[model samples]
Every structure is written in C-alpha cells, then in structure tokens.
Target: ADTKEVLEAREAYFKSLGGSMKAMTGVAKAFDAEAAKVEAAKLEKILATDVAPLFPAGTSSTDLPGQTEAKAAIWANMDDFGAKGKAMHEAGGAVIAAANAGDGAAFGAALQKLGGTCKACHDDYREED
Candidate 1:
C-alpha cells in the first residue's frame, strides 16, 4: 500500500529520524541533557507515531522503484521489526529520563544502550552505505 499518504509519512519519518540521530549523537558526545531532553522528546514522539506507518507494503526498497534501502525482510518479519521500533522508542525514553535526572553517567549508559538497540535493527534491516 504505497498510498500517497504513506509515502509522505515515510519521508517525514526519515527526516525526523535524522533529527533523532543528531540529538542522540549530541547526547553521546556531551551528555547535554537540555539538548538530549529536547531531542528525546522529539524522537519519542516520532517513534510513537511514525515508525509503523513508514513501512507501507509497497514502499519497501525491493518493491518500489525508489531510493530507500528498507529490506523486504522487514515486511516478512514485521513482528520483529515493530518490536525493534518499540525498543528504540523505549530507549529514547530512557535517555530522556536520564537527562531529566541530570545523571551524566546514566545518560551515557542509556545513550549507549539506545545506540545498541538502533544498531541491532540496522545490522539486519538496513543496507550499508
């Protein structure tokens, strides 16, 4: 279902995902809780609303004549894919909590954990650049 709405949502989802990367990277580098909290807020919201809808069946990289690298395996194992999505969403929450508490060490650890969760999916789901 590559409905126009789905494709548009996918585009917005990716753009927001880039925002998450910037915010997450900033947190990892500086433990800037103020920044991370803002970013985490943005990311958590996007993950809540965006991840599921971004993967419409017909828009898979294999299915569409498009530029994305989403693997067909994503559609095949949507259960796991959605699980990973939820994991990352919760990881964003962890970072937000750590940042809110002003716990630098905890923030770093949480950021690392979030990175691992993201990598877990990218390792299997995404094409290497």
Candidate 2:
C-alpha cells in the first residue's frame, strides 16, 4: 500500500498548498486594491493563472490520515468534487479575464467571488487548519 500512502501524502500536501495559494490570492487582491498598479498586477497574475490550475480534477483525495478536515464524503462523492474543481477553475478563469482587461473593478469583484467559492469548498470539504 506504499503507493497508496504516497498518493495520499501527495494529495494532502497539494491540499495544503492549495489553501496557501488561496490565502495568497486574498493578500494579492488586497495589495492590488491598495498598492502600486505594477506590484498589484504582478500579484494578480500569480493568483489568477499560476495558482489556478493546481487544483484540477483528480488532484486530491479524502482518505489521507491527517486530512480529517477533508470530509470522507469527498472520496465517496467523486462527481461532486470534480464539479467543484471545475467551478473553481472557471472562477480562476474569470479572474484572469478581469486582470487581462485591466479593469480594476472587474478584477476586484472577480477576486472576491473567487475567494467566496474557495471558502464554500473549504466549508464543505476541508477542515480548517
């Protein structure tokens, strides 16, 4: 079961990494709204494109030992998890679109919505760190 263990570990690590990326997105959005456009834009690019694809379908599992925060139901309900990941991807895409358009208002709104989506997923499927 070593492969299983490794897969689970990698999944857990990715989940933590995903959360970190989400937190970074929040920070980037705040900076974008309050700092120099150039710095904010750099952060925005990281958040919108760099971090978005890490949580694609099949990127996580619910069975890791220390991952009790991740509901067992996620593994049992793979379809729903995949759907959520797709939705997250879409949200990230929206953020990218807003950033590319150089529309500050659009970017801020999209970021807020994206954050809300992440929170919704965490609330349902992830344990709070």
Candidate 3:
C-alpha cells in the first residue's frame, strides 16, 4: 500500500540511509573512529530491521507511480534483495570493526565493501531519477 504512513516511513528510511552514507564518508575522511563506528552501527541496524519490511508488497513504483524509486523487481525478487541487505549489514559490521580497531586502511576497505553492496542492490532494484 502507498498509504501516507508507509510512504512517509519509506521516504524517511532511504533519506536516513543516505545520511548514514554521508556521515560515514565524512568521518572516514577525517579518520574519526568514534563517529565512523556510530554511523556504521546505525547503518547495520537500519539494514537489519528496517530495509525489508518497509517495502511490503504493493509499494513499488509500478504500483505507486512517481511516489517511489523502487522498481517492481524488488517484490518479485525479495529473497535476493533481503540477502543483499544482509550482506550490507555484514559489511556495516566490518566497518565498525575496522573503526573500533583504529585501522585506517582496513576501514577504507570495509567501507568500500559496504558501498559495493549498496551499489549492487541499487543497480538491480532501484530506478534512478
């Protein structure tokens, strides 16, 4: 359903994910371990708890027109999508691990892994504006 509540929650979900990326990237550049860990934890939590349930069954752009950027392929291939979310969540944990260990090189690699997961899923399921 594209009900107001679902739509709003979905929008906010993506927006906050974007914010996590921005904050993580900024802290990564500054080598701010504490902030990096905080943002990474946030990303993992969202990926774990919020990513799959928000989509429901009938909220794809095909069903809601311009209301969303999610392609109908998401609902069609939800198990794969959920797996990608899990991969991202694991990558998010790797990021936190690197940050907690204060390893800049490892942190960069882990962040790239996190980004690759996001890119893979977006390429398959999200419709670009």
Candidate 4:
C-alpha cells in the first residue's frame, strides 16, 4: 500500500510538472514572437505577474506544490536559487525595455541573456532527459 501511494504521488508530481512546463513554453513562444517585432510588453507583464509567483518565498529546498523540473538541490542551495531567479527577472525586464524602445540589437542581446539565465538554472536544478 505504501509503495502504491508513493507511485501515485510521483505520478501526480509529474503531471504538475507537465502543466508548469506548458505554461512556461507558452510564455517563451509569446516572447519569441513579440521579440522578433520589438513588441514585448505583454511578455513582460506575464513574467512579472504570472511567472514570478511560481518561485514562492522560502521554496529553495522544498518541492514546490506544482510538479517542478527543479530539483531538491534548489532548497539546498537557496542563496543561488534566489540569486538566479532575481537575475532572470532583471534580464527579462531588460528585454522588455529593449523591445519597447524598438532597439532590435538590444532586444536580441537581452533575450539571449535572459535565456542563458534560465538555462543556467535548469542545468543546475533539473535532470537532463
């Protein structure tokens, strides 16, 4: 019975992870489309308002309520986790500003940097397929 419960719990966790990934993928697609045209205010709004809360306070080590690709190591290395999140947020804001200003080069650079931030976090906290 205990084994069954554990399996069920893992399945539920995986489902939640899928849902979160879907939401993030949507955000990425939207940003890519807008960034190509130098119009990304909507993307910025989503990042700040929607995605920001996903990394709740004191969630460094705990497996978040949702199925997260994030590892338990996030909590183990709380400082780095928070730092990366904040850095990504800042980079995302820069991308939005560059897009609004219609500076294609700046927008592209910022977007790349923002992506790098995500990649860094994932490399550190997520398992590779």
| Candidate lDDT values, in order | 0.77, 0.56, 0.82, 0.57
- Candidate closest to the true structure, highest TM-score: 3
Whole-model lDDT for model 4 versus the true structure?
A: 0.57
Top-lDDT candidate index: 3
lDDT of 3 by residue, 1-129 (tens): 446778788788878878887788877788877776677678767666565557888887888899888898988899999899788878888887898887877988888898899899999999996
lDDT (10s digit) by residue, model 2, range 1-129: 354554555465555536645654664556453432443444344444333333333434444455335566566666776666667767766666666666677867777777777777677777655
Regions of model 3 farther than 4 Å from truth? 44-48
**Overall local distance difference test of candidate 3:** 0.82
Sorted on lDDT, best first, the list reads 3, 1, 4, 2
TM-score of each: 0.82, 0.57, 0.86, 0.58
- A best-first ranking of the candidates according to their TM-score comes to 3, 1, 4, 2
Residue 86, model 4: lDDT of: 80
Error of 3 at 114 (Å): 0.3
Q: CA RMSD for every model?
A: 2.1, 5.9, 2.0, 7.9
Residue 55 in model 3: shift from native, Å?
1.2
> In model 2, which residue pairs have backbone atoms overlapping below 3 Å?
69-127
Model 3 is weakest, by summed lDDT over 10 consecutive residues, at 44-53
Give residue 17's error in model 1 in angstroms: 2.2
